C-alpha cells in the first residue's frame, strides 16, 4: 500500500474508535454482544455517530499544523480553546476545561502556563494529550521530531511527564505503524528503547515517584504487553488489572497498543467476518473504562498500519465529519509527505 492510504486510514481509524467507543465511555463493564450489535447496526438491511473531544481536538491539531505548515504552539492553543468555546459539550474531561478557560483570557501571553500550573504545578497526567496526537506523526517523518512535537503539542494541556510521555508513546506507535508490517516483538522493542530513555529523565522519575508508582510506568507496561502476547489466553480482567482502561495516560496508551498488537490475530469471540482493524476497535471498546479514547488511539495505530483497505465504508460513512477527516488526511500527505 501507499503512504497516502495509511494517512487516510490513520485518521479514519481514530474517528471510528471515538465515534463507536463514545456510547460506552466510563462504563466499568461492557457486554461484547452489545458492542457487536452496535457495530453491526452500521450495516443495516436494504443519524451519524457524533465524535467527541478526542476527534475535536485531533481536528484542531491537524488544522494548526496545516495552517502554519509546522508546529506552532500559539496557533494550536488558540484553535483548541476556540474549538472548545464553540462546541463545549462534546464530552471533554473536567480537568482540561479549566485550561481552556485560562487560555481564553486575553492576558494569557504564555500558552504553556495554564497546563503547567494545573494540579498545584504538577500538571495533568490524563490521556487528553495522546488522544489527539496522531497527526503529529503524519506531519513529521523523523523519530526525533515526532517525540519533540508530540511532547510540545501535549504540554499545551497536559504538563506532567506522565501525561506528555503517554502522548510521545502514542505518536511513536503511530510513527512505527507507518512503516507497516512488523512482528509484535520488533514493534515493542523499538517503543521500549525510546521510553526507557525518556523515563530516565529527572522530571519523569520525579513525577512517577510523586505518584508513588515504583516508576517506569510506560516501560514496565511495554514489557508486560510482550508477556501478555505470549500467553494462550488473556482475560479482559487481566488486561485491565495489568495495563488498565483508565483516563490516566499510563492506564490507556499501553492498553491501546496491546489491543493493536493482540488483534493482529483472530479472536474466537469476535465473528470471522470482521477484519483486523474492526476487531481492534471491537476488542478495545469491549475492555470498558475510557472506551472512546482507548479506541481512538488503537484506531489511529491500526489505521496507519492497515490503511484504507480495512476501513469499512459502512462504518466510516456512519461517522460525523468523515469526509472532512479524509480531506485533512489527504492535505497532511500533500503538505508534509509528498516532497
Ligand atoms: Cl489512498
Ligand atoms: Cl528533565
Ligand atoms: Mg471523548
Ligand atoms: Mg474518553
Q: Where are the domains of the chain?
A: 1-339
- Find the 203 Cα to ligand 2 centroid distance in Å: 4
Q: Which three cell numbers stand for residue 63?
A: 488544522
3-state secondary structure the chain: CCHHHHHHHHHHHHHHHHHHHHHHCCECCCCHHHHHHHHHCCCCCCCCECCCHHHHHHHHHHHHHHHHCCCCHHHHHHHHHHHHHHCCCCCCCHHHHHHHHHHCCCCCCCCCHHHHHCCCCCCCCECHHHHCCHHHHHHCCCHHHHHHHHHHHHHCCCCCHHHHHHHHHHHHHHHHHCCCCCCHHHHHHHHHHHHHHHCCCHHHHHHHHHCCCCCCHHHHHHHHHHHHHCCCCCCHHHHHHHCCCCCEHHHCHHHHHHHHHHCCCCCCCCCCCCCHHHHHHHHHHCCCECHHHHHHHHHHHHHHHHCHHHCCHHHHHCECCHHHHHHHHHHHHHHHHCC
Q: Are 166 and 249 in contact (CB under 8 A)?
A: yes
- Find the 196 Cα to ligand 2 centroid distance in Å: 14
Thinking of the domain 1-339, which architecture would CATH place it in?
Answer: Orthogonal Bundle (1.10)
Give the resolution to one decimal, in Å.
Answer: 1.8
Nearby residues for ligand 4 (ion, Cβ within 5 Å): 290, 292-293
Residue 12 to residue 98: CA distance in whole angstroms: 29
Nearest listed ligand to the Cα of residue 26 = 4
Which residues does the chain break after (C to N > 2.5 Å)? 46
Q: 121: exposed, middle or buried (C-beta count within 10 Å: 0-12, 13-18, 19+)? A: exposed
What residues contact residue 15 under an 8 Å CB cut-off, 6+ apart?
Answer: 51, 55, 296, 299, 316, 319, 321, 322, 325
Residue with cell 490507556: 252
Q: Which three cell numbers stand for residue 128?
A: 487528553
Q: Are 19 and 320 in contact (CB under 8 A)?
A: yes
Residue 28 CA, distance from chain mean position: 20
Residue count of the chain, please give it. 339
What residues contact residue 295 under an 8 Å CB cut-off, 6+ apart?
Answer: 16, 17, 18, 20, 21, 259, 281, 284, 285
Residue 46 to residue 319: CA distance in whole angstroms: 19
- Find the 238 Cα to ligand 4 centroid distance in Å: 21
- Find the 4 Cα to ligand 1 centroid distance in Å: 5
Q: Are 284 and 17 in contact (CB under 8 A)?
A: yes
Residues 55, 36, 180, 132: what is their CA dihedral angle, to the nearest 10 degrees?
Answer: 10
Q: Which three cell numbers stand for residue 260?
A: 493493536
Q: Which three cell numbers stand for residue 106?
A: 486575553
Q: Which three cell numbers stand for residue 101?
A: 478557560
**Alpha-carbon distances of 40 from 20, 44, 48, 131, 231, rounded to whole Å:** 11, 7, 14, 25, 30
3-state secondary structure 97-139: HHHHHHHCCCCCCCCCHHHHHCCCCCCCCECHHHHCCHHHHHH
Amino acid at each position: 500500500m501507499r503512504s497516502l492510504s495509511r494517512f487516510r486510514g490513520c485518521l479514519a481509524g481514530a474517528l471510528l474508535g471515538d465515534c463507536v467507543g463514545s456510547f460506552y465511555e466510563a462504563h466499568d463493564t461492557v457486554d461484547l454482544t452489545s458492542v457487536l450489535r452496535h457495530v453491526q447496526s452500521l450495516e443495516p438491511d436494504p443519524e451519524a455517530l457524533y465524535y467527541t473531544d478526542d476527534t475535536a481536538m485531533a481536528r484542531a491539531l491537524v488544522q494548526s499544523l496545516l495552517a502554519k505548515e509546522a508546529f506552532d504552539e500559539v496557533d494550536m492553543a488558540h484553535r483548541f480553546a476556540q474549538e472548545y468555546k464553540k462546541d463545549p459539550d462534546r464530552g471533554y474531561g473536567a480537568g482540561v476545561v479549566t485550561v481552556f478557560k485560562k487560555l481564553l483570557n486575553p492576558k494569557c501571553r504564555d500558552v504553556f502556563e495554564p497546563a503547567r500550573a494545573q494540579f498545584n504545578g504538577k500538571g495533568s497526567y490524563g490521556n487528553g494529550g495522546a488522544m489527539r496526537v496522531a497527526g503529529i506523526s503524519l506531519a513529521y517523518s523523523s523519530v526525533q521530531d515526532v517525540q519533540k512535537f508530540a511532547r510540545l503539542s501535549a504540554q499545551l494541556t497536559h504538563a506532567s511527564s506522565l501525561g506528555y510521555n503517554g502522548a510521545i508513546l502514542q505518536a511513536l506507535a503511530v510513527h512505527l505503524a507507518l512503516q507497516g508490517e512488523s512482528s509484535s516483538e520488533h514493534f515493542l522493542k523499538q517503543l521500549l528503547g525510546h521510553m526507557e530513555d525518556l523515563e530516565g529523565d529527572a522530571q519523569s522519575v520525579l513525577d512517577a515517584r510523586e505518584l508513588g508508582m515504583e516508576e517506569r510506568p510506560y516501560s514496565s507496561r511495554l514489557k508486560k504487553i510482550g508477556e501478555l502476547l505470549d500467553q494462550a489466553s488473556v482475560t479482559r480482567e487481566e488486561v485491565v488489572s495489568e495495563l488498565g482502561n483508565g483516563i490516566a495516560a499510563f492506564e490507556s496508551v499501553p492498553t491501546a497498543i496491546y489491543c493493536f498488537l493482540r488483534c493482529m490475530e483472530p479472536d474466537p469471540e469476535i465473528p470471522s467476518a470482521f477484519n483486523s482493524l474492526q476487531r481492534t476497535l471491537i476488542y478495545s471498546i469491549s475492555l470498558g473504562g475510557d472506551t472512546d479514547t482507548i479506541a481512538t488511539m488503537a484506531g489511529a495505530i491500526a489505521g496507519a498500519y492497515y490503511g484504507m483497505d480495512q476501513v469499512p465504508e459502512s462504518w466510516q460513512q456512519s461517522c460525523e465529519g468523515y469526509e472532512e477527516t479524509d480531506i485533512l488526511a489527504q492535505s497532511l500527505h500533500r503538505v508534509f509527505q509528498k516532497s
